[PDB]
């Protein structure tokens, strides 16, 4: 819903959050099609790291849920979610592993489709000092 | 307090409320006077009538005018519709502080700061009267709603009550022949400075700047140069009735009574506006609005809003109710309290109102609720949300507090709230701020009962005992339990059918009318949310959605019954009439007509003969009679109205008989129609009708194509010539093929200059001689054999049918 905001001023990060979460949960709570449609627009005009994020997420999204594979294909063939720069390299790998390969690797790789690191709860202390400055 | 209006104009010395309309006039120190539609927000007028302060301002509404008095020393009369000065007259020789208008003849009173107030007759040459007494400035003159008397507030420490038809004041002793005024010590001490004394009033607070009345009381309150306000009886000059209100800090410019509250509103030249207790006569509370000083005050004699003038401008401010709960029985509106006291019933387009006795409310409304059979009214009183108050029940047709104290009807008892509920004589009450049930034991229930309690929801208003803490909750008759809760979007209202078992709730489009608990019977069709609408128990639903009262439906019919000239809410439908009351609560009534309703009741039951009479100009419109009746695919309604050349056209395709189409198509003056009806014609089967149409749309080539298909050869030739000239090569060209010999083409093609094509066509039929002619006239060489033959037999037997398909048989249903 939050992603409905603003197409590319919303930043790399929100797109990365809806993208990461939609990838990882693999919505059956709402139809993933809204999520996908929202993320698809954001990627075009936002930074490399999210566009690369979007292909890899899609791949994991493929491995966790079979249903998803058709959307992965429309998104990845595009000049956006693949074939930009960084986005291409990751994509060539992620795509080829999903498309071409066994997906022993893809399957293994998704354990929920989790983040890259699990820290503590950083915000609250930061916030404590930061407010009366 | 709510701020309806606030316009910064700078120092307003005079302010007056219009008694006819909800308008304000202000006279400013800047020399400008302004007339405001304070509710509408539209400046009516603006005049710079004097260089300096204009201290007095009045409405002269006997004919549509306003009157001003300025420090030009004149009382001037002004047009608000034509913006011109109607008449000008010499009030006095000093500042006109306040001006008042007589309703006797176009006489004008001016009060001045040269110690007299005079009344002047324009209509004739006469100055009819001068009223004298003051020894120092008459700051204000004020009308009562009767025109016979006025009060003046002056700064010689008095209030002088005057007669305007009278020479000064009018009185004569019956116990003596002598003048009422004594210049000697009698039973009171005063000078000789009057002709006679009707009533010399105290005003002592070192002079009273202003005096004003409550609309329904003889009592007057005055604000004076000191810091007190003193309330007076002007009807007796008593000094055993006069109480002083203390609160202000500096010279009180005015004090006037709030018409619609039991408080006295004062304002002073300090920086505060103070509000006073009118059952205690001392300051309840002080407000500062920080517009500084107030030099004028006003209380509305039309009992609308209230207003006070300050040194920055003026504010008209609101202490009134919006969207009140109501129900209509047969000819009685019962509503919850609003300004201008109790009103209602009668009229149908006017903003006037008139009284009938149908007061559902006659005391502070904690609750006002109808009986579901509509025979009693419950009014809950003595306010509170604690666990007790009083509730008084009234009879619905004519309402008193008690009807008789010696009769079961009109009784009262305790209960924080009591509200009627179904079983049609029952009520449910809160008397511990729990849900308690009320019986009396036969008839409409009036007596307090303590058994049965709950622990959910909290006492308030209703009609089925509504209570809220998070939703609108309907409660049971004899059970403590919640009967149901409703949650929905509202437009600030709860709409009852008339019987208070049922409830109508407003939704995103229109309104839904529902039964007891929450069960939706139907939905009213209409795009936007209606303001109010009510159902005559079911069936005939009449509603307001603008300025007009229209029926959502009666017997599948749809009508707008009539428009009123004001926006309104339907009070409800009980009987044929529908009754309405708006926010200000002025009534409109409307008889449900046999206009729109009869016409479509008749059309539904396939009567057209009935319907012709029914057609009137109160319901004709454009498309409900003269073109809505062209809306059957097997024409029935269509047959009846056919007057429009378009409706006639339409009618024809819907039958499939286009004989009528061509004529409508004709009368539509248009080609397109002829080709389209001609195509429909070919569909009914017959090509004579098609030809005629198609010929005049100029589709000779379509015809040429049609024609062997149809099996005519004579008609097929006619097409060929009149398509020759167009050089339609898929028109003129066709027909030669279609007859057994090709000669037709040969000449047409010759004229085209297509000599080659002309030869090939001709040659093959064995008309080598014509083929040769074309070669000889033009470029020869006929020897060549193309991918098609150039000389092989062409002969076709044309149309074996003796009767053609222009003569396609038909019977027609």
């Amino acid at each position: 819903h939050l992603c409905e905001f603003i197409e590319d001023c919303e930043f790399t990060v929100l797109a990365t959050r809806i993208l990461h979460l939609l990838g990882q949960e693999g919505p059956k709570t709402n139809n993933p099609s809204k999520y996908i449609r929202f993320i698809y627009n954001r990627v075009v005009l936002e930074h490399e790291e999210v566009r690369a994020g979007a292909v890899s997420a899609l791949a994991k999204f493929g491995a966790q849920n079979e249903e998803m594979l058709p959307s992965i294909l429309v998104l990845l063939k595009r000049c956006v979610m693949d074939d930009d720069n960084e986005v291409r390299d990751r994509a060539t790998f992620y795509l080829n592993v999903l498309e071409q390969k066994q997906k022993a690797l893809n399957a293994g790789y998704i354990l929920n489709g989790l983040t890259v690191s699990i820290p503590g709860l950083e915000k609250a202390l930061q916030q404590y000092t930061l407010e009366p400055s | 307090m709510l701020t309806k209006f606030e316009t910064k104009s700078a120092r307003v010395k005079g302010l007056s409320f219009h008694p006819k309309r909800p308008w304000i006039l202000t006279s400013l120190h800047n020399g400008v006077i302004q007339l405001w539609d304070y509710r509408m927000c539209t400046l009516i007028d603006k005049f710079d009538e004097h260089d300096g302060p204009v201290r007095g301002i009045d409405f002269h509404k006997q004919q549509p005018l306003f009157v001003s008095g300025g420090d030009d020393y004149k009382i001037k009369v002004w047009n608000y519709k034509l913006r011109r000065c109607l008449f000008t007259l010499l009030g006095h020789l000093d500042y006109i502080r306040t001006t008042f208008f007589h309703h006797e003849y176009p006489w004008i009173l001016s009060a001045s700061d040269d110690q007299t107030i005079r009344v002047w007759n324009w209509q004739s040459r006469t100055c009819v009267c001068v009223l004298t007494g003051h020894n120092h400035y008459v700051m204000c003159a004020q009308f009562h709603p009767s025109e016979d008397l006025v009060v003046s507030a002056s700064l010689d420490q008095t209030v002088r009550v005057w007669d305007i038809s009278g020479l000064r004041k009018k009185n004569l002793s019956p116990g003596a022949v002598e003048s009422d005024v004594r210049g000697i010590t009698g039973v009171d001490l005063f000078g000789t400075t009057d002709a006679v004394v009707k009533h010399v009033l105290e005003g002592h607070d070192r002079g009273v700047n202003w005096a004003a009345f409550h609309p329904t009381m003889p009592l007057i309150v005055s604000g004076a140069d000191d810091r007190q306000v003193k309330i007076w009886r002007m009807n007796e000059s008593k000094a055993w009735e006069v109480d002083t209100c203390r609160g202000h800090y500096n010279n009180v410019s005015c004090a006037v009574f709030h018409p619609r509250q039991e408080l006295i509103l004062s304002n002073s030249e300090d920086k505060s506006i103070r509000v006073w207790d009118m059952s205690k006569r001392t300051g309840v509370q002080t407000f500062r609005r920080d517009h500084d000083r107030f030099w004028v005050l006003a209380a509305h004699p039309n009992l609308n809003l209230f207003a006070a003038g300050h040194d920055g401008g003026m504010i008209v401010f609101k202490l009134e109710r919006e969207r009140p709960a109501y129900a209509v029985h047969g000819n009685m509106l019962h509503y919850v309290k609003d300004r201008f006291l109790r009103q209602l019933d009668f009229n149908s387009s006017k903003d006037v109102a008139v009284m009938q006795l149908r007061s559902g409310s006659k005391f502070p409304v904690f609750n006002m609720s109808y009986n579901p059979a509509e025979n009693a009214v419950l009014l809950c009183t003595r306010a509170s949300n604690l666990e007790n108050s009083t509730y008084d029940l009234y009879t619905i047709p004519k309402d008193a507090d008690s009807q008789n104290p010696d009769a079961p009807e009109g009784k009262r008892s305790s209960g924080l709230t009591a509200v009627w509920v179904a079983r049609n004589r029952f009520a449910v009450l809160d008397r511990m701020h729990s849900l308690l049930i009320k019986n009396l034991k036969n008839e409409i229930t009036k007596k307090i009962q303590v058994p049965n309690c709950d622990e959910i929801f909290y006492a308030g208003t209703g009609n089925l005992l509504l209570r809220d803490a998070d939703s609108i909750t309907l409660f049971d008759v004899q059970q403590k339990r919640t009967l149901a809760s409703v949650k929905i979007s509202k437009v600030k209202y709860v709409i009852w059918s008339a019987d208070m078992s049922h409830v109508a709730l407003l939704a995103k489009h229109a309104i839904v009318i529902c039964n007891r608990k929450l069960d939706a019977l139907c939905n009213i069709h209409e795009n936007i949310r209606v303001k109010s609408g009510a159902w005559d128990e079911s069936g005939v639903f009449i509603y307001t959605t603008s300025n007009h009262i229209k029926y959502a439906v009666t017997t599948g019919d749809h009508g707008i019954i009539r428009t009123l000239d004001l926006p309104i809410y339907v009070t409800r439908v009980k009987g044929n009439n529908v009754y309405c009351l708006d926010r200000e609560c002025r009534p409109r009534v409307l008889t449900i007509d046999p206009t729109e309703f009869k016409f479509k009741l008749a059309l539904i039951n396939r009567k057209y003969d009935e319907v012709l009479h029914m057609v009137r100009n109160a319901k004709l419109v454009g498309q409900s009679i003269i073109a809505y009746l062209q809306k059957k695919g097997y024409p029935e309604v269509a047959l009846h109205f056919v007057k429009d050349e378009k409706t006639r056209f339409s009618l024809a395709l819907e039958c499939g008989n286009i004989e009528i189409a061509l004529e409508a198509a004709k009368a539509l003056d248009d080609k397109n129609c002829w080709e389209k009806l001609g195509e429909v014609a070919l569909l009914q089967g017959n090509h004579q009708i098609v030809e005629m149409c198609y010929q005049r749309t100029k589709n000779f080539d379509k015809l040429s194509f049609l024609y062997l298909i149809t099996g005519n050869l004579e008609k097929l030739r006619k097409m060929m010539k009149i398509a020759e000239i167009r050089k339609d090569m898929s028109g003129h060209y066709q027909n030669a093929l279609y007859l057994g010999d090709v000669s037709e083409r040969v000449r047409i093609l010759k004229n085209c200059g297509q000599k080659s094509l002309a030869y090939l066509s001709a040659a093959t039929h064995g008309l080598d001689e014509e083929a040769e002619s074309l070669k000889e006239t033009f470029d020869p060489e006929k020897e060549t054999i193309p991918d098609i033959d150039p000389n092989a037999k062409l002969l076709q037997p044309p149309a074996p049918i003796m009767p053609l398909d222009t003569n396609w048989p038909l019977l027609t249903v």
Partner: protein, 813 residues
């Protein structure tokens, strides 16, 4: 008197005064107030009285002036006659010895198409039959033609009076001065005479002959007029592939874009077109003629190519001219676009050669590397050119400068498998001085894929692996990359296997190798280590591992369709992206009817009352963007009158100062306080006022970005697709469903509409309607659609949000 509409009383006074100046000024003041459009008939007798006979030209000229702009309307001092006060003593004016008064009189008199002046204008040609100036003879041919126009198409105007009645047009041809008011409908003999006149011309007169009769056999014969026609005539006799080399068109053409760069840019376009007509592939578009400035002899001195170099631009002239120029280099010379884009890109892209083409802003540098590189991807020949230039890009040897360089080249290798083996050794070099992500990413990818070719890798990688800079995204790129190509083909103190070890540690593992990697924790949350960790089945060897992936390119990669490409030269593209390419009681009843496409609001006005309502007038109002196309016009609403009165309606207008509600309808009658009442006919909404407009995907996208649309609602009855209810309803709140924002598949396929409007509300309106129609096992809410809405401050956003639900009105009176 600029425009003062009330001043007519003073003008009468000023009009006769015994002072000629005052009279002239007055009459002048009348003229200026009429021309603006203000009050004038009061004056007429005064105006007419001084001036009438006189030969004194100035007043006469002034009165003569006023008779061509209002004569018909004004009637106090004129009335209606054949010899009106416009012309009765102006027969004298016509027959004065001074040419000016006669001439002037003739000129206005004949100018009118008035029938109350038809006779006096006919022998008015006498005044100018003698020709004292060129003006007199021209005045005459125009006046005879104007007489002919004024109801005298027959014998009253056609022959001669004594020299002209429709014959000045003939005479003019052979006389010293020409002018032919003969353009249509006039003597054949004069038309013929004008042809003769082409030769014996008078130049102003030639433009008059020429509008009538054009096309010459000659080159010319002289003068601008003939000259202007002549370029039209030339374009006929050679239409073929534009004019090519612009004729006499060139002179007007420059002024057509006086603002100032746009002329050169345009001029540059034509000059490029003209050079040659090439193959005309993708951005090779040069039309006009094939040879007319050739291209490319080797004996041509100082050659064509010198002008071609201008078109290759960095900005070498200014930006508007730049964008045109880059396209224009591409257009004359390339293979498609690719060839000349590589040359052009070589100049633009970052080097160590020139520091006027390098910059330390990373994105622009990177983009420039990608543009150069896309040419290779397009066309093979370019691969060979690109790789050595890319190594020069690297040689800059700033952390960032290397970085951008490495990033594209690595993509090129994915396309270009073991072809760019050579580059790897160059690419390592600047990888050691490092402060950024980009350098690490790219280098690690080249060095990684390329391992067979080199053997250096522990040494190069290791300085960086223990160096710092920024390392998020570094992880992702190194993770898929480091091992690749040939299992044991390197060694410096770490063979390819150490690299696989490293590659795994950098991805997410841990291992001593290359003196440990900089970071291990991956980039954006989805990517992780694991895929690749699993991978490297066969240790960094071309098989079905990282190497495979690395030496292969994801999907199709060809052209400049943006598949490993970027679409021309990076600077020109910014401009192309920017280009959005946007395209008194009263009763009313009412219904809306349409017959023969006339849209009307039917109203019936009803007086149910016995009371008098005479003075009855009916008006439909203009509120804002609503307007009357003709109010209802009957004088109905009389004692017990039922009437049907039709008020025609429009929806599109310009805002009026009166209220902006539903529809205002006004009926007037008897009453003096409320002489005019406002009462309603059925619903019309605020939504009308919005104005529909449309967007393309680019405009939609730009506006999405421009202002927020987070605001969403879910609207019921959006179960249906875009096309059905949603379009129709969206239309009524002046919106339209255009382009998509969807991404459909077997899991995706919400219908998406991009909406636009440009409301007359100071806002636009946009929305996206997403229709949640199940294309998954877990839909949002099943069928229904969520509309994400905005407007420019989202004040119309809300209109979109609810006007896509339902909407219907009907009545049946």
């Amino acid at each position: 008197m600029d425009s003062e509409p009330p001043s007519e009383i003073s003008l009468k006074n000023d009009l006769e005064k015994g002072d000629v100046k005052s009279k002239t000024e007055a009459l002048k003041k009348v003229i200026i107030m009429i021309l603006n459009g203000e009050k004038l008939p009061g004056l007429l007798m005064t105006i007419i009285r001084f001036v009438l006979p006189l030969q004194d030209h100035t007043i006469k000229k002034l009165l003569l002036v006023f008779w061509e702009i209002v004569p018909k309307t004004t009637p106090d001092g004129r009335l209606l006659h054949e010899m009106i006060l416009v012309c009765d003593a102006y027969r004298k004016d016509l027959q004065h010895p001074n040419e000016f008064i006669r001439g002037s009189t003739l000129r206005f008199l004949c100018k009118l198409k008035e029938a109350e002046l038809l006779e006096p204008l006919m022998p008015a040609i006498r005044a100018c039959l003698e020709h004292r100036h060129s003006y007199v003879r021209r005045n005459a041919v125009l006046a005879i033609y104007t007489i002919y126009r004024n109801f005298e198409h027959l014998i009253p105007d056609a022959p001669e009076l004594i020299h002209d009645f429709l014959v000045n047009e003939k005479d003019a041809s052979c006389k010293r001065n020409a002018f032919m008011m003969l353009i249509h409908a006039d003597q054949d003999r004069a038309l013929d005479y004008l042809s003769t006149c082409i030769d014996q011309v008078q130049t102003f007169g030639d433009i008059l002959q020429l509008v009538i009769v054009e096309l010459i056999y000659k080159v010319c014969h002289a003068n601008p007029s003939e000259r202007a026609r002549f370029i039209r005539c030339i374009y006929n006799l050679l239409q073929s592939s534009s004019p090519a080399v612009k004729y006499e068109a060139a002179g007007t053409l420059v002024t057509l874009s006086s603002a100032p760069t746009a002329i050169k840019a345009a001029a540059q376009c034509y000059i490029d077109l003209i050079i040659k007509e090439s193959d005309n592939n993708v951005k090779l578009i040069v039309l006009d003629r094939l040879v007319e400035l050739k291209e490319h002899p080797a004996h041509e001195r100082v050659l064509q190519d010198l002008v071609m170099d201008i078109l290759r631009v960095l900005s070498t002239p200014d930006l508007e001219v730049r964008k045109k120029t880059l396209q224009l280099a591409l257009d004359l010379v390339s293979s498609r676009n690719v060839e000349e884009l590589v040359i052009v890109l070589k100049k633009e892209v970052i080097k160590t050669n020139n520091v006027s083409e390098h910059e330390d802003t990373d994105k622009y540098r990177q983009l420039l590397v990608r543009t150069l590189h896309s040419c290779s991807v397009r066309f093979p020949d370019m691969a060979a050119n690109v790789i050595p230039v890319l190594m020069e890009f690297l040689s800059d040897s700033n952390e960032a400068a290397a970085a951008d360089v490495l990033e594209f080249v690595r993509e090129a290798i994915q396309r270009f498998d073991n072809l760019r083996m050579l580059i790897v050794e160059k690419m390592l070099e600047v990888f050691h001085a490092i402060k950024s992500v980009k350098i690490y990413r790219g280098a690690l990818w080249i060095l990684g894929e390329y391992c067979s070719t080199k053997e250096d890798i522990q040494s190069v990688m290791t300085e960086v692996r223990r160096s710092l800079g920024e390392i998020p995204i570094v992880e992702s790129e190194i993770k898929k990359e480091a091992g690749e190509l040939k299992p044991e083909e390197e060694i410096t103190v770490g063979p390819v296997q150490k690299l696989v070890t490293e590659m795994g540690t950098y991805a997410t593992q841990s291992a001593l190798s290359s003196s440990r990697p900089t970071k291990k924790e991956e980039d954006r949350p989805p990517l992780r280590g694991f895929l690749l960790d699993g991978d490297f089945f066969v240790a960094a060897s071309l098989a079905t591992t990282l190497t495979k992936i690395a030496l292969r390119y994801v999907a199709l990669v060809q052209e400049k369709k943006k598949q490993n490409s970027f679409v021309a030269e990076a600077m020109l593209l910014m401009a192309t992206i920017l280009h959005l390419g946007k395209s008194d009681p009263v009763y009313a009843e009412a219904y809306v009817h349409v017959n023969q496409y006339d849209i009307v609001l039917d109203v019936l006005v009803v007086n149910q009352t016995s009371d008098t309502l005479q003075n009855c007038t009916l008006e439909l109002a203009t509120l804002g963007d609503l307007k009357l196309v003709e109010k209802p016009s009957p004088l109905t609403l009389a004692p017990h009158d039922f009437a049907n009165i039709k008020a025609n309606v429009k929806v599109a207008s310009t805002e009026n100062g009166i209220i902006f509600g539903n529809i205002v309808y006004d009926v007037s009658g008897a009453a003096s306080d409320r002489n005019c009442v406002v009462l309603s006919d059925i619903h019309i909404d605020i939504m009308d006022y919005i104005q529909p407009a449309t967007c393309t995907d680019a405009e939609f996208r730009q506006m999405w970005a421009e202002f927020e649309w987070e605001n969403k609602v879910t609207v019921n009855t959006n179960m249906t697709d875009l096309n059905d209810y949603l379009q129709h309803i969206l239309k009524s709140t002046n919106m339209k469903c255009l382009t998509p924002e969807k991404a459909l598949s077997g899991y995706c396929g919400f219908m998406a509409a991009n909406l636009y409007a440009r409301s007359i509300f100071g806002e636009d309106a946009l929305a996206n309607v997403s229709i949640e129609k199940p294309v998954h096992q877990g839909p949002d809410a099943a069928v229904t659609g969520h509309i994400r809405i905005r407007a420019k401050s989202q004040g119309m956003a809300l209109s979109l949000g609810d006007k896509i639900n339902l909407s219907q009105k009907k009545t049946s009176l």
